[PDB]
Amino acid sequence: AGIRLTPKEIVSKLNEYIVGQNDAKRKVAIALRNRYRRSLLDEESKQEISPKNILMIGPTGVGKTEIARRMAKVVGAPFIKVEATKFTELRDVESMVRDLVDVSVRLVKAQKKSLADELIDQESANQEALELAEQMGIIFIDEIDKVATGVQRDILPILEGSVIQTKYGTVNTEHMLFIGAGAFHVSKPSDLIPELQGRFPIRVELDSLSVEDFVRILTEPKLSLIKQYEALLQTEEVTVNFTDEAITRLAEIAYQVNQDTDNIGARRLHTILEKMLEDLSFEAPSMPNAVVDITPQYVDDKLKSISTNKDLSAFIL
């Protein structure tokens, strides 16, 4: 019964994991809220309305996949992510639905437990996941601007509502929430087939990330990037401390290197962190119960000479 969450609560839940993107959090929340409102209606009306599918528009590294993935995680919905550019060949587009039933049974069994010890009725469990997927599932179709200007026609019956054959039974894709995402640098949403345009009533244009947005992505969300390296090096009994001046120095370098070559967004932070933490990671076992403080000087000693050379950056970080 996490479907009863009001939109304001979902925006608060999604703030614990995703920095900014307030505009994208509302439109994601009112799509879920419509699924709740649909169930409180009469049977002839509950079945003839269509979900408020979302069309996300923005570059990479802005966190439009986390907004959708965490969205299903908090409401307890089955989530799947498919790359639309894998279907361009000649295609079993319905595999995106059978994979949703495959992830729904694992979610239902996971919550059937905690409530090698199978004391749960597998039949009723599978038949609940079969219903949870078709009444609450979420399919994230990534890179959908690359099937626009053949593949959209096969995605259509899934959004239009069809009954797809799965190993556990038949599921109905009428009330599944669909999210399309892409950069739309060459094609526009108006270049999608008209049937797809009408079936994406909610559309959001996500914002770009500034150099001051990385320092939040780096420190703020629940289990951020540097929080991971703290707990990882804490396995080797090494306490790591990042001075705020050094976190800001990593954000200034990632944003700067995202400018010289090509912009990948917050994904740049992964290669930046591991590169600077290389000496610490290699020598961590032979350094027990130590306390290491990361200063901006130590950051520039390992990155500033590399981040200045553009030709080196395209390869090593």
Curated annotation (Swiss-Prot):
Task: Give an example GO biological process.
Answer: proteolysis involved in protein catabolic process
Q: What does this protein do?
A: ATPase subunit of a proteasome-like degradation complex; this subunit has chaperone activity. The binding of ATP and its subsequent hydrolysis by HslU are essential for unfolding of protein substrates subsequently hydrolyzed by HslV. HslU recognizes the N-terminal part of its protein substrates and unfolds these before they are guided to HslV for hydrolysis.
The protein's matches in Pfam families, at most eight in alphabetical order, are given as: AAA, AAA_2, ClpB_D2-small
Alphabetically list the UniProt keywords.
ATP-binding, Chaperone, Cytoplasm, Nucleotide-binding
- GO MF entry, a single one: peptidase activity
According to its UniProt entry, this protein's organism is Staphylococcus aureus (strain Mu50 / ATCC 700699)
Q: How does it assemble?
A: A double ring-shaped homohexamer of HslV is capped on each side by a ring-shaped HslU homohexamer. The assembly of the HslU/HslV complex is dependent on binding of ATP.
Identify the Gene3D superfamilies for this entry: 1.10.8.60, P-loop containing nucleotide triphosphate hydrolases
Extract the InterPro entries matched here: AAA+_ATPase, ATP-dep_Clp_protease_ClpX, ATPase_AAA_core, Clp_ATPase_C, HslU, P-loop_NTPase
Quote the HAMAP family the UniProt record gives.
HslU
Query: What protein family does this chain belong to?
Result: Belongs to the ClpX chaperone family. HslU subfamily.
Q: What is this protein called?
A: ATP-dependent protease ATPase subunit HslU
Which compartments is it annotated to reside in? Answer: Cytoplasm
One term under GO cellular component: HslUV protease complex
Residues recorded as binding ATP, renumbered to this chain, are V19, G61, V62, G63, K64, T65, E66, D142, E195, R267
